[PDB]
Amino acid sequence: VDFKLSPSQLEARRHAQAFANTVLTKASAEYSTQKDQLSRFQATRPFYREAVRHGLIKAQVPIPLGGTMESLVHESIILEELFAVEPATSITIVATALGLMPVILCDSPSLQEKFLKPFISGEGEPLASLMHSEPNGTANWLQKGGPGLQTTARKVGNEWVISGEKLWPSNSGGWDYKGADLACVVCRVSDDPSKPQDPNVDPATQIAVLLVTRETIANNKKDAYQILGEPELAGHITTSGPHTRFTEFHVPHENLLCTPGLKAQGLVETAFAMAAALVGAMAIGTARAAFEEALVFAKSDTRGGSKHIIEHQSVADKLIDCKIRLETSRLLVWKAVTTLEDEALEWKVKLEMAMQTKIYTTDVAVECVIDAMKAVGMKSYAKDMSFPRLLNEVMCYPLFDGGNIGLRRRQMQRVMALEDYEPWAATYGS
Amino acid sequence: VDFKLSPSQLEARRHAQAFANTVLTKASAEYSTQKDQLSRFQATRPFYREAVRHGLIKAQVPIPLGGTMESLVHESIILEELFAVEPATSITIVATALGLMPVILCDSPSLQEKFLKPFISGEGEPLASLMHSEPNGTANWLQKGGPGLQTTARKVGNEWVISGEKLWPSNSGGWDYKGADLACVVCRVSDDPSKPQDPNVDPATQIAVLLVTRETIANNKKDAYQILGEPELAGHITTSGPHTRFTEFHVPHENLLCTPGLKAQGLVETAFAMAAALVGAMAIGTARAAFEEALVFAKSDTRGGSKHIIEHQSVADKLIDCKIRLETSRLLVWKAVTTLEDEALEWKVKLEMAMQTKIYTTDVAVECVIDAMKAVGMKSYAKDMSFPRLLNEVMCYPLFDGGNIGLRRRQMQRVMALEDYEPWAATYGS
Amino acid sequence: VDFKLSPSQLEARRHAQAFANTVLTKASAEYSTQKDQLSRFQATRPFYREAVRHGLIKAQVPIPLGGTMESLVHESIILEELFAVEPATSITIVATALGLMPVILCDSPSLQEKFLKPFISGEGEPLASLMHSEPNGTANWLQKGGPGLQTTARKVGNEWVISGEKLWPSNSGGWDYKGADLACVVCRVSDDPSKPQDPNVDPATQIAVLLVTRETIANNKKDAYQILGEPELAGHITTSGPHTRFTEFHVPHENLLCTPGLKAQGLVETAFAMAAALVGAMAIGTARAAFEEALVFAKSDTRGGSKHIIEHQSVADKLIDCKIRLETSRLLVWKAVTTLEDEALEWKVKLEMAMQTKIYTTDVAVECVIDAMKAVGMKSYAKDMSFPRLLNEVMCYPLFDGGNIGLRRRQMQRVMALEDYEPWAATYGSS
Amino acid sequence: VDFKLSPSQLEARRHAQAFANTVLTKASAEYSTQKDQLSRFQATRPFYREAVRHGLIKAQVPIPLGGTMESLVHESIILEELFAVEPATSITIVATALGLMPVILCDSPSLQEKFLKPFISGEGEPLASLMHSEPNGTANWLQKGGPGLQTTARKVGNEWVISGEKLWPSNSGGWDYKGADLACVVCRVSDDPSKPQDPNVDPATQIAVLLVTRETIANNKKDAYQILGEPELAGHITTSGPHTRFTEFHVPHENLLCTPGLKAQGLVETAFAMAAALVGAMAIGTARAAFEEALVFAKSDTRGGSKHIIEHQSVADKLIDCKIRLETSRLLVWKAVTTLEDEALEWKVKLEMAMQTKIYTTDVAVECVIDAMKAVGMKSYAKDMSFPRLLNEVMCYPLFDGGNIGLRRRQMQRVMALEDYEPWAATYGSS
Ligand SMILES: Cc1cc2nc3c(=O)[nH]c(=O)nc-3n(C[C@H](O)[C@H](O)[C@H](O)COP(=O)(O)OP(=O)(O)OC[C@H]3O[C@@H](n4cnc5c(N)ncnc54)[C@H](O)[C@@H]3O)c2cc1C
Ligand SMILES: Cc1cc2nc3c(=O)[nH]c(=O)nc-3n(C[C@H](O)[C@H](O)[C@H](O)COP(=O)(O)OP(=O)(O)OC[C@H]3O[C@@H](n4cnc5c(N)ncnc54)[C@H](O)[C@@H]3O)c2cc1C
Ligand SMILES: Cc1cc2nc3c(=O)[nH]c(=O)nc-3n(C[C@H](O)[C@H](O)[C@H](O)COP(=O)(O)OP(=O)(O)OC[C@H]3O[C@@H](n4cnc5c(N)ncnc54)[C@H](O)[C@@H]3O)c2cc1C
Ligand SMILES: Cc1cc2nc3c(=O)[nH]c(=O)nc-3n(C[C@H](O)[C@H](O)[C@H](O)COP(=O)(O)OP(=O)(O)OC[C@H]3O[C@@H](n4cnc5c(N)ncnc54)[C@H](O)[C@@H]3O)c2cc1C
Ligand SMILES: CCCCCC[N+](=O)[O-]
Ligand SMILES: CCCCCC[N+](=O)[O-]
Ligand SMILES: CCCCCC[N+](=O)[O-]
Ligand SMILES: CCCCCC[N+](=O)[O-]
Secondary structure, eight states: OBOOOOHHHHHHHHHHHHHHHHTGGGHHHHHTTOSSHHHHHHTTHHHHHHHHHTTTTGGGSBGGGTOOBOOHHHHHHHHHHHHTTOHHHHHHHHHHHHHHHHHHHSSOHHHHHHHSHHHHSSOSOOOEEEEOOOTTOSTTTTOTTSOOOSSEEEEETTEEEEEEEEEOOTTTTTTTSSOOSEEEEEEEEOSSTTSOOOTTSOGGGGEEEEEEOHHHHHTSOGGGEEEEEOOOBSSOTTOOOOEEEEEEEEEEGGGBOSOTTHHHHHHHHHHHHHHHHHHHHHHHHHHHHHHHHHHHHHHHOOTTSSSOGGGSHHHHHHHHHHHHHHHHHHHHHHHHHHHHTOTTSOHHHHHHHHHHHHHHHHHHHHHHHHHHHHHHOGGGGBTTSSHHHHHHHHTTTTTSSSOIIIIIHHHHHHHHHSTTOOTTHHHHOO | OBOOOOHHHHHHHHHHHHHHHHTGGGHHHHHTTOOSHHHHHHTTHHHHHHHHHTTTTGGGSBGGGTOOBOOHHHHHHHHHHHHTTOHHHHHHHHHHHHHHHHHHHSOOHHHHHHHHGGGSSSOSOOOEEEEOOOTTOSTTTTOTTSOOOSOEEEEETTEEEEEEEEEOOTTTTTTTTSOOSEEEEEEEEOSOTTSOOOTTSOGGGGEEEEEEOHHHHHTSOGGGEEEEEOOOBSSOTTOOOOEEEEEEEEEEGGGBOSSSSHHHHHHHHHHHHHHHHHHHHHHHHHHHHHHHHHHHHHTTOOTTSSSOGGGSHHHHHHHHHHHHHHHHHHHHHHHHHHHHHOTTSOHHHHHHHHHHHHHHHHHHHHHHHHHHHHHHGGGGGBTTSSHHHHHHHHTTTTTSSSOIIIIIHHHHHHHHHSTTOOTTHHHHOO | OBOOOOHHHHHHHHHHHHHHHHTGGGTHHHHTTOSSHHHHHHTTHHHHHHHHHTTTTGGGSBGGGTSOBOOHHHHHHHHHHHHHHOHHHHHHHHHHHHHHHHHHHSSOHHHHHHHHGGGSSSOSOOOEEEEOOOTTOSTTTTOTTSOOOSOEEEEETTEEEEEEEEOOOTTTTTTTTSOOSEEEEEEEEOSSTTSOOOTTSOGGGGEEEEEEOHHHHHTSOTTSEEEEEOOOBSSOTTOOOOEEEEEEEEEEGGGBOSOTTHHHHHHHHHHHHHHHHHHHHHHHHHHHHHHHHHHHHHTTOOTTSSSOGGGSHHHHHHHHHHHHHHHHHHHHHHHHHHHHHOTTSOHHHHHHHHHHHHHHHHHHHHHHHHHHHHHHGGGGGBTTSSHHHHHHHHTTTTTTTTOIIIIIHHHHHHHHHSTTOOTTHHHHOOO | OBOOOOHHHHHHHHHHHHHHHHTGGGHHHHHTTOSSHHHHHHHTHHHHHHHHHTTTTGGGSBGGGTOOBOOHHHHHHHHHHHHTTOHHHHHHHHHHHHHHHHHHHSSOHHHHHHHHHHHHSSOSOOOEEEEOOOTTOSTTTTOTTSOOOSSEEEEETTEEEEEEEEOOOTTTTTTTSSOOSEEEEEEEEOSSTTSOOOTTSOGGGGEEEEEEEHHHHHTSOGGGEEEEEOOOBSSOTTOOOOEEEEEEEEEEGGGBOSOSSHHHHHHHHHHHHHHHHHHHHHHHHHHHHHHHHHHHHHHHOOTTSSSOGGGSHHHHHHHHHHHHHHHHHHHHHHHHHHHHTOTTSOHHHHHHHHHHHHHHHHHHHHHHHHHHHHHHGGGGGBTTSSHHHHHHHHTTTTTSSSOIIIIIHHHHHHHHHSTTOOTTHHHHOOO
16 A cells, blocks of 8 residues: 655646646636626636636546546545645536536447547636526425426427526536536436326436536527526635526437436446545645645744744644644545446445545535634634635535535445445455 | 523524614625725614614613613623624624723723713713734733733823734724724833843733723824734624724823722733623624524425425534534523622632633634535525535634633633632632 | 522532542442342342431422422432442432332322322432333334333223233342332233234323332232343343242232323323433543543553643543533533423423434443543553443443433434424523 | 555554464463563563564664664554553663653764664564653653752763652663663763752753663662562553662763753653654553453343343443444544644644543543443453453553643643644644
């Protein structure tokens, strides 16, 4: 077993840090000046353009698909460094990556070639979105007996017709509310969009993913695709993840990602389990920024006393706790993404690892940021320090990407309850 | 022992809720359009005016002093109702109360009558402020052989001359930066400001409190009193607590609160100890608002499932923990204020109880808000719910009114280390 | 609102202290030498005798019923002082109090007069036991569609017949395994013990409670009431709460405590909810003993340094946290018992408050003992300090008297889910 | 970066498991019937014999030193497997390894060859102990201006004369109180023992380590080496770690490990930092036993309900939390041991990682056991389940091997406070 970073991982770190310091630090000057969530997102466009030019969107797609992704550990390193500086634009990159994932993961070369093409060109500012989340919630979307998804799809001739509402998926409406360059819309199949989900069919058997591009939208009536609103978020105030209504929205059958059923659900589940492990790196970036800011402060400030405040056991205790949280978190993230790249391990072992990772790292990042503030004291509460921003940004992570309480803990619980559950398979082999 | 409330305690609650609901709810529409801390503060002036008209500033002064305060438990009840709805203005009220406290606690009847008049008249928008905190910090203000307060006073003829900077004291610059109506300025006596505090003199013996009014500031040259800035706060975004510089600022001897030294230190400690005990009520208000919004949601929303989310054990576990924190918190606050009113108890005993209360209630309120957010899920993160506001507001509490880590725990530790420490004196007697 | 203690409350404290210091301190020298759980229990009989002589058993019974209980705050105060010194015998008193409660709470003066008699007497060593817990667990005893209690009673003639097993109930087999002087046996009504509980009927409507005495056991075959075993406990090593099998156990119909069904469930619920509130005083006692031993050590030992270890911010932080946990706990117990005594409040308001109390106090007392040990350091891990005993005894509280995970959180959760739940009714009332 | 285990790592695991299952599981029958700590330790001797026979003591010693230790990860794997079954004898193995460490780490090939020979032999039951801890504590042994270690040494002629007391060092008295085969005794140099440590000289500059064999003790007056007692511990009840008194105890100069001073301190510090990382594996084993017992239970028991208790979210939550603590803990131990092995890293970087590991894994192991107990509920509290043992055993870890509060957080704090502190140097490399 080894923890040593290769030259290309060190170089990926160097490159991510250089990009964040020279490009991302300037985003705040542009977006802070804007009035609402969409305008803040829009003032972020020149910085995503730079991200594209730095090869960062191409790095979200595997090499066999024409991208430059080196490995998931490389990716973990990048996100940490990005998020330790500025989640604006960084968020847009990872949300794009998530929106690409169902295409990346499907076993269909013609779809991949066609739909991933903008994202590997090194040009423009193409956006992708994985549109799963809804106004009514999604934690119980697979509950047998439940109403299931409320965005539904039905086949009419050689096309599918989308009826329903999405909320929260980042990037979904693109820069201009005319749509992301690629959207994967997760629907529950329903011949009659008025009828309740049959309580005798397993909901997983009814999942479809339909690909929607700016063209798919242009080919529909204006009112088939409506942006009803843009949430005003506590943190990550420069991301767009609007409220969208599909009314009789027409999609060619050839934009169906795969066969409806367990296979489509399986693509969603896999995309989101990967996000589950990677999200830890984002949480670590934010929590690390908080810890480093409080550490530097405690090593250089006496707070009107005779010694630097780090010399006070109660201050040191907080920073020790912060440090431990960060170190365990990063090890767990590298363990998780590594577990997910292991072809010899069954899916349930990977899924369990991914769930643990999202839960621990996101819960713990919050404590880390709050302990850092308590260490600094009153000064941390004002916006001449990073902490007010970090506080709001860190509370996103346990709630988003499938909240820990409703989704990730129940996904994990379900695995552990299975008769063939092997707790240590990812460590000691099966 | 008895927990029952009197008809007048119940009336204070009703009176406070009604004021909050009918008046304070309207403040957001006014302050939300202003684009800085001072402008947001100024936008709250009409609500503090209404607070005065409702007798709330008068209720901060005890009855023997011409005020209408019935007890500390009434006060706790009022603050909880107020902070449960809107800390805008509510914060101005308690900051005034703290500002008035050295005068209320001192025992010069004619000084009291003179300086408390505007606050018991039921007219205008009079502000008070206890100016203690400094740019360099104050956790070590009493550390022997340390720098001490960087705000310093010297006697010159019939007058005192203040040199130095304050930062954070709410209300200190008034509505218009010409000063609060009454500011109690905490100084370290020093004949030569350019020389360090004498390391062989106990810091507590050099403490003086000087009363500075709008007239005092008007009697000075323009560059003797200046606002250098106004912190942009994570939460409580409508309060004012600026960065003030005193340069050769002249104050009349008749404005000295009491003889410099231990009695002046004790006036400060007592004011901040009362505040330590009452601040729990503010924290309870904020956390209760979170808990109740979460509870209501959890009993009305299935999150696309077949039952209300309160029916899920993990969700209910969060609300349970929330409830418990709030209930233990309120009990401890009532215990604390009651202990402070008990004339048969030593200061040591009252102080320790006051410290415990500040520490517990303020730490636990944070957890209570965050757990409520986890229970509600993604929806808690958008500003059409109150949690973004509450998350920022609740984080003030462990940091302000003497941070838990640097000040409150150290004060409690010093009591516990005393040879004659009686841990249960407040319960079972001495 | 007032936190002042009356002369009688301070006298109950002094009295309770005097007893624990002069009597209970001597108990360890006897039970320490004993081979097993039962031997250790029997070895505490002389001390329970002294508790009866000090009127402590009589103080578990209300005054209207010939006992000397002044209030639930008095009771809280007493239990805290007792458990601070020694949970041995102290546990027996309180397991007797719980055993008496369904009788204390019933609507029948004649049942009360007959059955409470030896406990208000001031003589002998009478034991009571509320026999509810079973080998297979009880957290789901009221779940519709589940197997329910596996101790069952049928009516045959002028008698009820008990079939089944009990486990854990303290005092249940008395000093000699011929039974507690009084046992309230909580049964599921089943005409055929071999048939599974009907999934169509609310389990709560099938609850019956049957009073079983040493006489009842004597009037039965010797193999109709058997003690299968005695659990060896982590802490509270001197209690007895054996594994008891009822096979065709005959009980007179006049020993039926009340009408089976929602009324008998009410009695069990009410009894355990009062236990929920008062158990906190026991947890406080144990954790207070940990805090105080750690406080004294921290204020007197430098651990080979230049200053007493309380001067180290990290050590003080631990003591602070202990203090806070204890202070918030007591406040919560007093609020809960007073809430239980307030005749103006709906039952569910009282129940929620008792549930909170049990949950907070028992969880937090474990934290309090462990932080106390961390503060003392390595020394705390050796049996010349109290901590090894306290650690073991403290871990009982979150698990016994209805564990927090399975039972008390679920009871609380049910209340909160009700359409007319009033979170603050016990503080502010109502409508 | 790589997490995959090699064939020899997987074999090391299999071998440790086999030994734990077939040998160590039989240990309890023998020690349970003994009366006190020493007797329980002595009853353990034949299992330690079997451990030597299985190569496990030899595997505590690096290959270039004659041993068979393949790496610290191999070591970590072994310790977790052993401690997941039975810490009796297992603790004796690791206490010996600690005792061997200052010798293993010194730079003298002849001294190593001489003093390590018994331990690489494959025969007997040789014991080693690092005797550092003292009655008055050691958290402050390096505090300038403090009393310092109370066990002092001074040179008289061609020998050293030890005066004072040790407390806690496992194995220190050997099987029979005539001494461990090898004991490294840590002393503060002092010409007049009745005079206080000079407040002007750095305590670290005054540290010496003298090797004490059974022969050294044989060559002294009988009352020069006295065992004054044997602590009764809450857990790990089969270990011996006596109170020892040295009175004018003569040791040959050839038994001095190195010149007194910073180099001697450094060897003690490096020994205890290696232990600090590896103790995590011991904590993980104990807490893993607790988690697996609770998990198996949750998956096979409905607790009188209709579904296995793992289906209740609150139960699931506990098990999820235990699982996360264990996973994060093992990763951090492997990270930390691999950090200690990296020749390219500064010591401060290694030290900091080792302190983090000890603090986190040991605190978090206690939580894991407790949560597991809470999820099993009342059944976890009786000695027919593992938990009572597990609870007492797990509480040792935050306290021993340098307590978290007094020592490990202070060691970590000092490193963090240094001008040149690089937080991420073990991850991203130095600058
Ligand atoms: C910046 C940002 C970017 C995002 N990106 C995307 C994206 O690209 N695509 C996308 O689809 N979504 C996206 N999301 C949404 C995110 O994935 C959310 O996690 C998702 O909406 C699910 O939220 P939830 O876990 O709160 O579930 P909800 O269904 O909203 O449930 C809320 C709460 O109900 C309770 N609950 C409900 N059911 C249960 C149960 N069975 N058991 C226990 N508790 C239960 C839980 O306490 C839970 O927290 C984004 C959100 C943000 C803020
Ligand atoms: C809305 C608002 C209203 C306010 N009202 C007032 C007011 O009316 N009057 C007023 O004077 N101030 C006011 N303040 C400031 C408030 O009282 C702060 O608590 C005060 O500034 C002290 O800050 P601090 O506790 O962080 O101490 P600091 O001196 O700034 O120390 C900061 C941190 O350093 C560490 N530290 C320093 N010394 C030690 C030590 N010896 N031991 C251990 N750790 C140490 C601790 O981590 C501590 O948190 C207000 C602030 C706000 C935001
Ligand atoms: C010293 C001592 C004295 C005692 N005194 C008495 C007495 O006088 N009378 C008496 O009757 N008993 C007594 N007991 C037993 C005590 O009341 C226990 O609390 C009782 O057995 C119930 O235990 P439990 O809550 O662990 O439930 P169990 O049914 O054993 O459940 C065990 C675990 O399963 C899980 N679980 C089961 N169902 C659910 C669910 N629905 N939702 C979530 N989790 C679930 C929980 O994690 C729970 O902790 C005593 C025990 C001891 C050690
Ligand atoms: C099974 C077992 C095996 C052991 N093996 C060995 C061995 O092989 N060799 C050996 O030498 N010892 C051994 N020990 C002892 C063990 O290493 C202890 O950790 C050691 O005694 C130090 O204990 P301590 O950390 O509590 O220090 P102490 O000096 O006893 O301090 C105790 C407490 O005081 C407080 N404190 C003291 N100073 C400070 C400070 N400056 N700052 C903050 N807080 C402070 C802390 O709260 C601390 O926990 C063993 C013990 C056991 C039970
Ligand atoms: C790679 C992970 C990006 C996180 C996307 C947000 N979300 O899934 O809710
Ligand atoms: C009673 C009001 C307390 C508010 C004062 C805030 N502070 O002291 O920092
Ligand atoms: C009033 C004290 C309750 C005794 C505990 C018995 N039990 O319910 O498990
Ligand atoms: C790996 C060594 C642990 C055994 C002794 C621990 N200790 O130093 O106290």
